[PDB]
């Protein structure tokens, strides 16, 4: 009766590292003196044969899982999503992939990861109240001033100020969907990068002036300190929630425990541990 937890590699929520030679996880420490709590999470390493191996998982969402498990008295085992995706609906009877598909098929009983709460997913699964707010922001070289999604250099684009996101990413899809972002979308389309890592160096390399991406990740990328920086107000806000099936008996208590944790400062401690730089 161990709950099967599915997660995904997404820093700083979930770090995934190889085990040491004896198969244990390296003992490490947080920014405050605290020991980093690590769990073994099995999953693929790298077309590919998807050979499953014990790996070390830690971070915001792992700390949360450990708290939840304690609080609600459940045991668990953690694995990484086999296809490496959060989850979208696709066809060829439409079917969810990623963590969404694993939860619905029974391969997982709970999704503990920065899983964006949205209408399409909520039609199928239950989200907890948010354990963390979600939004987009902008990544630029230090010294650049962008106000947010309503800045004239974004609203009225030219090749003098090039902005983009990752091709076919969740952000790209979101932008294509809004007719009011059309003019903004045609500019991005011509400049979108293949991966976040390829977008970010481009910002370092003055090849791309602004990268639009998840806010938590961008502050983290910026935390290197500091040829890069984040600018403006967050936009297109939502939240990250624990995902469960509609008939889960744990769902109300998971949500209540998350509210309790926001209210007593536990979540701020996590913010200080993993997302405050």
């Amino acid at each position: 009766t161990r709950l099967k937890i599915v997660t995904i590699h997404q820093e700083p929520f979930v770090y995934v590292k190889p085990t040491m030679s004896d198969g244990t996880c390296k003992e490490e420490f947080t920014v405050n003196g605290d020991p980093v709590k690590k769990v073994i999470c099995t999953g693929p390493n790298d077309g590919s044969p998807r050979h499953t191996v014990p790996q070390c998982c830690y971070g915001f969402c792992i700390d949360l899982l450990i708290k939840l498990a304690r609080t609600m008295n459940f045991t668990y085992e953690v694995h990484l999503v086999a296809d490496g995706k959060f989850g979208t609906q696709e066809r060829v009877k439409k079917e969810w992939n990623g963590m969404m598909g694993e939860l619905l098929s029974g391969q997982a009983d709970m999704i503990v990861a920065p899983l964006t709460i949205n209408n399409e997913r909520a039609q199928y699964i239950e989200f907890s109240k948010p354990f963390k707010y979600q939004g987009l922001t902008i990544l630029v070289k230090k010294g650049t001033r962008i106000t947010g999604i309503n800045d004239p250099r974004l609203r009225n684009p030219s090749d003098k100020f090039i902005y983009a996101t990752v091709k076919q990413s969740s952000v790209d899809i979101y932008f294509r969907r809004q007719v009011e972002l059309s003019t903004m979308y045609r500019h991005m389309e011509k400049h979108n990068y293949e991966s976040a890592a390829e977008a970010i160096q481009a910002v370092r390399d003055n090849k791309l002036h602004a990268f639009i991406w998840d806010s938590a990740v961008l502050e983290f990328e910026a935390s290197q300190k500091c040829d890069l920086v984040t600018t403006g107000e967050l936009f297109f806000r939502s939240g990250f929630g624990i995902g469960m099936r509609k008939d889960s008996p744990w769902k109300q208590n998971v949500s209540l425990s998350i509210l309790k944790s926001h209210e007593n400062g536990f979540m701020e401690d996590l913010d200080k541990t993993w997302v405050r730089y």
Partner: protein
């Protein structure tokens, strides 16, 4: 039946109350009808319902929900308390109206917390909020959890700070920081307007209150002297409160997330909550 009793509470810019046109008795433009029970005198509880008009961020939310979830409503302003407090084991305010089945739902600047969630169901949060701190520009504090608040008789002279009593903010401080809480009572403010005056004229050093309202107020403070620290502690949201087990909760959640997905929440936020500061 799909004609619903719905309770609200004035709090700009979330719910703003206007006098109705005496020559028409019809609410117009972006307003909707809302009634308020007003006593004839202080001898008895005899009163009359007064026809007024309501508008604001939450009213636009209500109108949209009315359309996509397909219900009509009779909106009234609560007169028994404010947002919600449990007094002698009996909930008052908007929460009380829902708990005691006087209202099918409560719409307004109603903060989701754990104790409320025990007696009502909340929708997904539709505005980010939590607890913030407002000061005059220059004053140094980090946030609620700051030791300048936690041990106010450390630090000389003693910091002067207060909240508006009986809402989620006081409830949080009372539970988390007993010393800070009993120290603040001296500086309790009757309302947000009083508090902002107390700050600007140096009678108060900090005002601890709902983040969404403080941010809005900072955004339009004359001269931009009042600012919010950093930040938000105990991040939660405003939620629509519904009776436990309510048949309306699922469609309301899906519709709110639909609004997020179609960019409409982002639009509403810039419409009602945009600041000049």
């Amino acid at each position: 039946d799909n004609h619903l009793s719905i309770v609200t509470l004035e709090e700009a810019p979330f719910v703003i109350v206007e006098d109705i046109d005496p020559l028409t008795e019809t609410c117009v433009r972006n307003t909707v009808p809302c009634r308020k029970f007003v006593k004839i005198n202080n001898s008895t509880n005899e009163g009359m319902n007064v026809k007024k008009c309501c508008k604001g961020f939450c009213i636009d939310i209500l109108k949209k929900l009315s359309r996509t979830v397909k219900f009509t409503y009779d909106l009234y302003l609560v007169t028994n308390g404010k947002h919600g407090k449990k007094v002698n084991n009996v909930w008052n305010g908007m929460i009380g109206e829902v708990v005691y089945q006087r209202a099918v739902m409560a719409v307004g600047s109603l903060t989701i917390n754990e104790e409320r969630s025990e007696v009502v169901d909340f929708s997904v949060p539709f505005v980010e909020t939590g607890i913030s701190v407002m000061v005059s520009r220059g004053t140094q504090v980090t946030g609620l959890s700051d030791k300048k608040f936690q041990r106010p008789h450390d630090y000389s002279p003693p910091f002067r700070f207060g909240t508006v009593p009986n809402g989620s903010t006081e409830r949080n401080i009372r539970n988390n920081y007993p010393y800070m809480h009993q120290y603040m009572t001296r500086f309790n403010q009757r309302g947000v307007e009083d508090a902002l005056v107390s700050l600007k004229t140096g009678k108060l050093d900090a005002f601890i209150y709902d983040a969404a309202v403080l941010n809005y107020k900072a955004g339009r403070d004359e001269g931009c002297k009042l600012v919010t620290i950093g930040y938000i502690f105990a991040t939660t949201g405003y939620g629509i409160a519904l009776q436990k087990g309510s048949p309306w909760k699922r469609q309301i959640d899906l519709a709110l997330l639909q609004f997020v997905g179609d960019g409409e929440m982002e639009e509403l936020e810039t419409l009602w909550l945009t600041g000049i500061c």
